[PDB]
Design a protein around this ligand. Structure first.
Ligand SMILES: *[C@@H]1O[C@H](CO)[C@@H](O[C@@H]2O[C@H](CO)[C@@H](O[C@@H]3O[C@H](CO)[C@@H](O)[C@H](O)[C@@H]3O)[C@H](O)[C@H]2NC(C)=O)[C@H](O)[C@H]1NC(C)=O
Ligand SMILES: *[C@@H]1O[C@H](CO)[C@@H](O[C@@H]2O[C@H](CO)[C@@H](O[C@@H]3O[C@H](CO)[C@@H](O)[C@H](O)[C@@H]3O)[C@H](O)[C@H]2NC(C)=O)[C@H](O)[C@H]1NC(C)=O
Ligand SMILES: *[C@@H]1O[C@H](CO)[C@@H](O[C@@H]2O[C@H](CO)[C@@H](O)[C@H](O)[C@H]2NC(C)=O)[C@H](O)[C@H]1NC(C)=O
Lengths: 132, 462, 132, 51, 52
């Protein structure tokens, strides 16, 4: 159960478990992005590639307005044509590992939507904080 | 009204800067072997997407002769050719007393190849066997001042040790695209009449530069970019004649060269487990190597070049003349073709004059008319100085052809005399920077500075 | 016009355009700070140089209190001696590429001002949240 | 049986041929999945996957 | 050669057949070598054959 106490689930413990269980204790996956030392050129290459990927994810999460590394509610309204599926259909017995097969088609739309939406957001504060 | 310092990120600001560049090949560069062509090895597959973007309201200075991009091109090609000749057999048992025979052609219009024989250290070392091979005369020298006219030495063995070029690597130029790293961009001058040094009033930006043919040539610029609208000339200081002039052609001049000799290869063992390829026979009648250029095109082209040259020397008419004179590799037009290296006597081309008086092309009475350059072949090569210079290019069997397009000239004026109305121009090959600089003139590397501060009517929220 | 819809300006599209036009859709420049793969030692060096640069910019921006990657209003009051120029003089027809020629001289002053001015802010929250 | 095909080299006496065990480790951002089924034939869905 | 004092060392004058730059055509050549850098070649009585 997700009532773990002190966390001991490991790296990918919630794989195959519910979306809700994997939603708690996300740090065990996030924190594991550091490793390695060097033989030759290929190992230092493998080291820097991880930093490249980490900064990809961190930047792309940042322009959406998400400095937090776990969860975000966002201003983009939901487009229901993507699944037209219920909350229990998606949340109660699916896992993330099989949720990624469905909406991975529409990630390249949602990414642009979030990117523009943060700009509709923060330009207004540049005006409101001047009116204040 | 009150203003506050407001800081922005993602600003479109940049400064010119120095940095390395990637190299990227076209998509079809990776079906071949390792190191063959070098485009498979040092470079990455390019993605043509995203394509060019034009910036609507910006103007920038472009300076071709101060561009460090060609200076990095030079180092790249030098290290990239130096790398390839590491595993290949580094000759050395061929520094021996070659005994050669006279042969007989008696004409002087055609050369023969000297038949030389030498004692070889076989693959089991200390059991020698005499062996013979044909050598082009420029690659062989008499051994000593003594009266023996039958003992010869290679042009190597006095200056440096030398290495054979491997047969599984080719000299053909695969196009190379130079790409920028992160945080930098390449600015493309879209002005189609830009001379080379000044503000480009139409500046674009591209992910990577268009393909460059690393074709090595001394006097003429073979396959490459063509001028968009007209012939344009480029030089730092035409008053001081010592600076090279780059002429850039709009209409190409077609050139074809051949070696009619049907050479046949031969193999010789050089120590254990490695071979030295050589020429062993000439099937059929010996004939002259040459290049053919159509007179109908060259005659038009050089007066078209004359009108452009008139502008910065308006006081004087124009005549063309022979090179300054010197060693073969200095004076002759040279190029690669199928693996062989040619050296053409170019006196027939650079002849004639222009006085602001155009002569008609229409009707072309004889399109089959030609002017024939006569060229010599070499196999011992000093391609760059200090690159591990010597390379032995092995012969290639059969007969070969060299069709290509001429797209520019490298020239140098002779000193003036008598305040003459008709001062002259000469060809001038030299440092290979001048060759690549003829084609890299469109580009400049810049560094994006996305962080900026400005005044604004908004303050911090507490 | 800045009313683009789905953004297609490209990387440096607003170069030469107004300050206001470039101020909207800043993400197209921010997102592209990445490129390359490796041959030998030099290209890997070029790869790590980009990360060095990106983290320099991010650290310098964050010490000022700017976690957001687009715009910040800051506590530092404006010193008018730097230009003594009007809002329309600076904003309505100039571009960022021509703005950088003027106040780039005074960046090394403003940077220290921002660096200290974040410390005159966050130490006080360390007191008020104890008083609360 | 050299000297016809290739040049040859002696193996040094201070290097040994004995196989020391080698462990292949994953870099950061990647994981290795171990098919924990004890009768797996080689190609198909492993119904018990470890990491 | 002749010094006979022992306060100063001389240099030994040595000569050798050289594989010249055209390999298999030797010529004799000589150079001066400091004595610490030269050793006699063999235990035999020949006092005129040396090795580096
Ligand atoms: C270049 O010089 C070489 C010699 O260094 C020439 O090779 C020699 O060619 C002759 C004529 O073919 C050979 O002689 C013939 O040999 C056969 C062997 O069965 C014999 O039956 C004939 O009575 C005749 O003697 C000779 O063997 C050959 N030398 C060697 C070492 O094989 C070569 O022809 C010359 N090439 C040119 C283009 O000048
Ligand atoms: C070290 O030993 C070498 C020999 O291994 C000495 O070189 C030799 O020096 C003598 C005296 O100068 C040369 O002899 C002269 O040669 C000329 C040639 O024109 C001749 O006309 C004279 O009549 C006389 O014979 C001798 O050629 C030379 N050897 C060589 C190979 O050149 C050298 O002097 C010795 N040095 C010392 C410091 O002991
Ligand atoms: C070897 O020589 C032959 C004969 O000169 C070449 O064959 C001609 O090639 C041209 C193209 O350059 C064709 O237009 C002709 O029809 C061909 N035949 C003749 C009889 O001229 C052949 O191309 C040469 N080999 C190479 C590799 O170029």
């Amino acid at each position: 159960a997700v009532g773990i106490g002190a966390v001991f689930l490991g790296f990918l413990g919630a794989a195959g478990s519910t979306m809700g269980a994997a939603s708690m204790t996300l740090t065990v996956q996030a924190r594991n992005l550091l490793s390695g030392t060097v033989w030759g050129i290929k190992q230092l290459q493998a080291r820097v590639l991880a930093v490249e990927r980490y900064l990809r994810d961190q930047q792309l999460l940042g322009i959406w307005g998400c400095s937090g590394k776990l969860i975000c509610c966002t201003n983009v309204p939901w487009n229901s044509s993507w699944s037209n599926r219920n909350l229990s259909e998606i949340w109660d017995n699916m896992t993330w590992l099989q949720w990624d097969k469905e909406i991975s088609n529409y990630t390249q739309i949602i990414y642009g939507l979030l990117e523009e939406s943060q700009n509709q957001q923060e330009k207004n504060e540049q005006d409101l904080l001047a009116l204040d | 009204e009150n203003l506050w310092v407001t800081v922005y990120y993602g600003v479109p600001v940049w400064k010119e800067a120095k940095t390395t560049l990637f190299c990227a090949s076209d998509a079809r560069a990776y079906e071949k072997e390792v190191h063959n062509v070098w485009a498979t090895h040092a470079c990455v597959p390019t993605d043509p997407s995203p394509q060019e973007l034009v910036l609507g309201n910006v103007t920038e200075n472009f300076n071709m002769w101060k561009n460090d991009m060609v200076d990095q091109m030079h180092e790249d090609i030098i290290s990239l050719w130096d790398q390839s000749l590491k595993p290949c057999v580094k000759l050395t048992p061929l520094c021996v007393t070659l005994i050669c025979s006279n042969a007989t052609v008696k004409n002087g219009t055609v050369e023969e190849m000297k038949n030389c024989s030498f004692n070889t250290t076989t693959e089991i070392r200390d059991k020698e066997k005499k062996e013979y091979a044909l050598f082009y005369k420029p690659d062989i020298v008499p051994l000593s001042e003594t009266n023996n006219t039958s003992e010869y030495r290679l042009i190597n063995c006095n200056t440096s040790a030398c290495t054979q070029a491997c047969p599984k690597v080719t000299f053909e130029p695969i196009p190379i695209h130079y790409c920028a790293p992160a945080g930098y961009a390449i600015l493309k001058c879209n002005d189609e009449t830009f001379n080379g040094t000044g503000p480009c009033s139409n500046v674009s930006t591209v992910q990577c530069t268009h393909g460059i043919r690393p074709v090595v040539s001394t006097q003429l610029l073979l396959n490459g970019s063509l001028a968009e609208k007209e012939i344009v000339i480029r030089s730092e200081n035409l008053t001081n004649n010592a600076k090279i002039i780059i002429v850039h052609l709009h209409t190409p001049v077609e050139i074809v060269c051949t070696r009619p000799n049907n050479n046949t290869r031969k193999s010789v063992r050089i120590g254990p487990g490695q071979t030295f390829y050589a020429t062993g026979d000439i099937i059929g009648d010996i004939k002259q190597a040459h290049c053919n250029i159509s007179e109908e095109k060259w005659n038009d082209t050089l007066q078209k070049v004359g009108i452009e040259l008139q502008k910065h020397f308006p006081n004087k008419t124009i005549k063309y003349n022979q090179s300054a004179g010197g060693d073969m590799e200095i004076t002759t037009h040279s190029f690669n073709c199928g693996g062989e290296f040619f050296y053409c006597n170019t006196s027939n081309l650079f002849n004639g004059t222009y006085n602001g008086t155009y002569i008609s092309t229409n009707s072309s009475a004889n399109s089959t008319s030609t002017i024939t350059l006569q060229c010599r072949i070499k196999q011992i090569i000093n391609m760059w100085q200090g690159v591990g210079r010597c390379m032995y290019a092995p012969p290639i069997a059969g007969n070969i052809t060299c069709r290509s397009n001429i797209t520019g000239l490298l020239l140098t004026r002779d000193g003036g005399t008598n305040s003459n109305e008709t001062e002259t121009f000469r060809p001038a090959g030299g440092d290979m920077r001048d060759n690549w600089r003829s084609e890299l003139y469109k580009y400049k590397v810049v560094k994006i500075e996305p962080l900026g501060v400005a005044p604004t009517r908004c303050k911090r929220r507490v």
